[PDB]
Amino acid sequence: MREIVHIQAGQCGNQIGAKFWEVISDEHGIDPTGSYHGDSDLQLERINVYYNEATGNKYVPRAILVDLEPGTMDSVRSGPFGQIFRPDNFVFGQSGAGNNWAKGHYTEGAELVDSVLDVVRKESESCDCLQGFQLTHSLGGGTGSGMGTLLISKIREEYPDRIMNTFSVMPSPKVSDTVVEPYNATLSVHQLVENTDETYCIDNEALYDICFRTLKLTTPTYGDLNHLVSATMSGVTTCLRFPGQLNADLRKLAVNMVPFPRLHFFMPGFAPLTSRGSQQYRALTVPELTQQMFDSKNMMAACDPRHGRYLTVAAIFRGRMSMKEVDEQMLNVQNKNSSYFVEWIPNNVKTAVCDIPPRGLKMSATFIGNSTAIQELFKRISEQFTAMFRRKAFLHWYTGEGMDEMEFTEAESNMNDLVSEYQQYQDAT
Amino acid sequence: MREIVHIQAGQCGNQIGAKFWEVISDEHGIDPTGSYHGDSDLQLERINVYYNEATGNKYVPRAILVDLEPGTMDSVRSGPFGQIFRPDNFVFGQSGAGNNWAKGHYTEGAELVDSVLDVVRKESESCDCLQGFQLTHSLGGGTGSGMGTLLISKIREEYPDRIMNTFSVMPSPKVSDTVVEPYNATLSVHQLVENTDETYCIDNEALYDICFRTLKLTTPTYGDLNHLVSATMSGVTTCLRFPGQLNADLRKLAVNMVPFPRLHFFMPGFAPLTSRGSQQYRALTVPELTQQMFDSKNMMAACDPRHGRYLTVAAIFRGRMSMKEVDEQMLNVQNKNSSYFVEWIPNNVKTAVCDIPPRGLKMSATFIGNSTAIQELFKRISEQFTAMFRRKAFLHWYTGEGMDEMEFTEAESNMNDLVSEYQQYQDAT
Amino acid sequence: MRECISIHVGQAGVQIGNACWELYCLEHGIQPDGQMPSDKTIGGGDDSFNTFFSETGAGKHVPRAVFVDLEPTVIDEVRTGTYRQLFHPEQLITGKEDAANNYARGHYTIGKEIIDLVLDRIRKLADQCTGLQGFLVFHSFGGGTGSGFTSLLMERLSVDYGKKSKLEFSIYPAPQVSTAVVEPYNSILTTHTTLEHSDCAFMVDNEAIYDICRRNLDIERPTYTNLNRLISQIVSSITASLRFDGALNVDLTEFQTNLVPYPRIHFPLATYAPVISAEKAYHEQLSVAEITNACFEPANQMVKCDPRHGKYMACCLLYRGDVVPKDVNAAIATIKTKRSIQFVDWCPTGFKVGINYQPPTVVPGGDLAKVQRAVCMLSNTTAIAEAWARLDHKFDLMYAKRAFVHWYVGEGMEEGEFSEAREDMAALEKDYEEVGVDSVE
Ligand SMILES: CC(=O)O[C@H]1C(=O)[C@@]2(C)[C@H]([C@H](OC(=O)c3ccccc3)[C@]3(O)C[C@H](OC(=O)[C@H](O)[C@@H](NC(=O)c4ccccc4)c4ccccc4)C(C)=C1C3(C)C)[C@]1(OC(C)=O)CO[C@@H]1C[C@@H]2O
Ligand SMILES: CC(=O)O[C@H]1C(=O)[C@@]2(C)[C@H]([C@H](OC(=O)c3ccccc3)[C@]3(O)C[C@H](OC(=O)[C@H](O)[C@@H](NC(=O)c4ccccc4)c4ccccc4)C(C)=C1C3(C)C)[C@]1(OC(C)=O)CO[C@@H]1C[C@@H]2O
Ligand SMILES: Nc1nc2c(ncn2[C@@H]2O[C@H](COP(=O)(O)OP(=O)(O)OP(=O)(O)O)[C@@H](O)[C@H]2O)c(=O)[nH]1
């Protein structure tokens, strides 16, 4: 019951999920080969949320790996965790995406999506009672953006009532490593609006900032930033897999995170984050963890909450903890900072408490915020977009691939309308 | 006195009876070899109802095994209970039946029935005072349907006043495992009308439903479903073999179960059915057993009694029980559910009470119902029949074997007339 | 036989019942494997296990209770846990997805799929009863199953049965502490069946219990497990005079006759006086006189409320243990004396006492000590309107902008239903404004 299909898409999608199924595969004591080597029978009661048991107690995930380039697949196969996936789930083309949206959504994506939805139906027809899906992908890539939004817009036609959420990486102007990532991000924000139930917006600068300031790292790679992100994605569905005192599925969050439809862009947050060495000097508690979660410097989205108001938040704690301290800390926050909350919603916070912490510490927590300050993201992109597009730069690589202008102007307007949706719900009483 | 000749016919017939003479052979403490190893002299007073005592206290049943295929016979011989039968009673041909009615009733059945009625007269000429016969067979097979109804229609010419009853398995549309089972079932319903004294209609879906819901089994085979059915067939003739407080032969049921001739199609029911583990959580009592015998989910016929009215029922209890609780429970039922009974019959229920429960528990019971809701069976077949026959599909394998069309149209009309016999006796005051 | 039915709905409703059915196991001397031990060659339905325990043959006690959830997960804590063979297997009914804090899902979409299987469990327990007393629904206002399903059930229980008492043990939403943000949506919609179909709805909330644990009891850090042992002593005393001897016994129906003035004024809060920590249990004077005064304390309330803000309408003293009545009548007369305690002017004769001989049990690993006497005071007061004013205002805020409406409409209810259940609760709060006021001539 309550299975989750994992569709990691693109290059970025595969890197995160590579590290994602290295965490989950530790949560449940899965061997690299696929056998089970746990001790506690909590690890197995709800293993089936992610893993198909196969013949002779091997555990094959329900993940589908999609790419338009053979490379990432060959890396994953040849690595520590190649053994863990089913080889019919490594679905990939040959001709690269171009870091071009048109090329992954119309030309070379449509060719492949038939051979992938046929793998979605291998997974969906085997489940007892499916709950949801998930992309892991990148707004700013070819396959992450384009092919991802082709997969999504073809699942709503098949499975129109399952919680489909994305962990999408969004561009930041301070750190650019692709010239047309405004073009590629604009045309996919357009698709995520109408098609998705929850969207966890993650940036790059926000992850260095955690590494530098909080964790006291020296030299971060993609390897390190997605290792964080995977500890968030584990937290989301903890109460789906572990027993808790308050439970919270995918659907439970969705329901009371999202005031209006369409405003389904969340800001995660993790706590605790210490350096090694500076762990014997923080006392690890619930007021300690709450103060980090309401800190700006522990947002994995490169914004400051202080430039708006949280509509709603959720607080997912993992550990042997109290309920008074939880119910109090979550109270003392929305009193002391009552101008940082939307006031037409009483009790902006939802708490959930699991019983099972991560496999090195006690008392973690995970903050998921629906803040109005996320329009700071959508405007920084729609300024770069409108500065290139007024010249019509880089246009022939897009009109060459089946698109035209009128897909742009509408997609620019769909991004600029929801800036005026966070804006309405920040102010006006 | 009051002997019963057992004619298990076909493949299905042999499987049930294999398991049937594993129960009876436990009721009377018969060794696999055929010696007696009981302790109570109740087991021997009426052993002769089923068993010929042979030379030197071995006990050979009065069963005749008929087949058109050597296989089932070789299985039974080579099994645990091969020793128990007399080897002159394993009567079988070589050429298979085809799951064809014509092939078992005219061509290859008629050839063999001479060598079988000569075995019927070995058994019938040895009995003190014969009571009855019994087929165990399958409406939907070649030998169960065809050869069975050839044996029946040739016994009424010899023994025209013995209670001949069948435990016939009837097809269900939810579970099909033969394409022309409408053809094979239609042409044998035709013979069971005019020739039989009681007919215990049993289905497949009704037996999974007992396994899944009530018994809490996992993975049923034919082995498991007929193990149930044999616990019904033991119950029928309990008071014929054991002493009781109310007695009840084959003839006693027949007489006050059957308002009109021709309406001799009964719905069995057994109680109790618990899983192991869920036995220390039911209190085992007469109101406990009564509620199982009238619940729809404990019918071995895939119907709901609520789609009609019981004409008559019989309630055959086996155990050290009271008579007030029996006489009351059977009263409180036909008061509270007075619209579920035909009202032109007072006291729709006949009780019989034996003294001897099965060899694991106290206080079993057996429900045998003459419900009007059995036309749900005859119509679901006469819809499949009339959908194939309008094309004349699969016709040359039947007209090839000595039949013709006019045997079909009449046999379809004999089934469709008795739908209008259960219909008349449901409604109309 | 004075038999009664527990129904435990949703996560909160199940997890209370663990703490209920832990207790009765100790009350009647029953092992978690349903067995009375060998030192009970005394009278069993004379100790009257037979209101909560159908005695299976061969000395085995299984409740008359049904554990219902739309989610598989909660009850699976009861399978195993330690209660894995206390319960009948067929009275632990699981769905596959919960209502997910959505009333429309618990009442229309998901709830209907298991509602007939649950009503059929009721009949299997209803037909085993001789002298059925009524039902005890446990839930929380502000779940999906606790609100949506309970609303669906209480409709069906009113139609099939009618005549019997149907008690509720709700958890009311707390004014500051809340964990769902649509918590007020699910409370307005459960208003409908709570006033109409229930015969007596109790309300508790978590903050008023946090106070008692921390202050009277010196527990640093309560969890749900700690609060529900407290809840269970209130219910254990309610239903104790059905099932033990005492002078002035009180059936389930003698509450309603003595507690409830008018049709829909049936929301009495409970208290419980001897909430005392082990150390503070010496340095006691825990007489009848002190424990009667402690009931009338605005701090010892189970609801975030202050009876100094309204008038009592009835009270109802249910005592257990080493009790001499004249001590009680002399403690009543003190209560009538004080003018800080406002009864209404149409009550005159204050309230109903009831005594029972069976002393409570100390729950092992539990939070209380060993007390000799114990008192719930079920008591109608006009101060529970204040709990409502603090929650209508949260509903009226969110529904002013039609916030979470799109989830609810797309699940099997209307926009129109919010406007009816808001009027419905506004009329209750108008009844308590008009029931507090005396008439003059
Ligand atoms: C001696 C000791 O206690 O070591 C700790 C440790 O020093 C700390 C610093 C860890 C450590 O984490 C990091 O340095 C880090 C690296 C990349 C990305 C994110 C963090 C640790 O590496 C991570 C590791 O985490 C776990 O085991 C969790 O279960 C976690 N797992 C993974 O991310 C993972 C790591 C390696 C291999 C496989 C999985 C998790 C979190 C959320 C959801 C699922 C799993 C722990 C407790 C530690 C070390 C090992 C030093 C911390 O992180 C986490 C997520 O627990 C960083 O701040 C916390 C506080 C811990 O005390
Ligand atoms: C502790 C206790 O009471 O155990 C029971 C038991 O648990 C139950 C569950 C039994 C049990 O049956 C099965 O588990 C089963 C498995 C596969 C297929 C069919 C049945 C039992 O095995 C079977 C067994 O039946 C008998 O012994 C009868 O004499 C029965 N005999 C056989 O069919 C038989 C089985 C194995 C070998 C040889 C013969 C019988 C019933 C009616 C008429 C004549 C005979 C019984 C009562 C039990 C066990 C032992 C657990 C039940 O079955 C029967 C036929 O009685 C299943 O539902 C009933 C209700 C019983 O209470
Ligand atoms: N006393 C007590 N109260 C609880 C407990 N769990 C939750 N509550 C409260 O009851 C409400 C929640 O009911 P839920 O468990 O959320 O829901 P449900 O009715 O079981 O169904 P879902 O919404 O589908 O999970 C909240 O407002 C809580 O404050 C518990 O263990 N004990």
Ligand SMILES: Nc1nc2c(ncn2[C@@H]2O[C@H](COP(=O)(O)OP(=O)(O)O)[C@@H](O)[C@H]2O)c(=O)[nH]1
């Ligand atoms: N978080 C994250 N983003 C990545 C990673 N690799 C690429 N990206 C992002 O993905 C986009 C480029 O798409 P890419 O994955 O190269 O497309 P490909 O042709 O399908 O490999 C950019 O917006 C990058 O920031 C990664 O490892 N982690």
Ligand SMILES: Nc1nc2c(ncn2[C@@H]2O[C@H](COP(=O)(O)OP(=O)(O)O)[C@@H](O)[C@H]2O)c(=O)[nH]1
């Ligand atoms: N109940 C039951 N039905 C059976 C069994 N085996 C075959 N059948 C039924 O019998 C029909 C096939 O006839 P069969 O017995 O194979 O004829 P054969 O050629 O004489 O063996 C189908 O309708 C089946 O449902 C059995 O073991 N039990």
Ligand SMILES: [Mg+2]
């Ligand atoms: Mg729940």
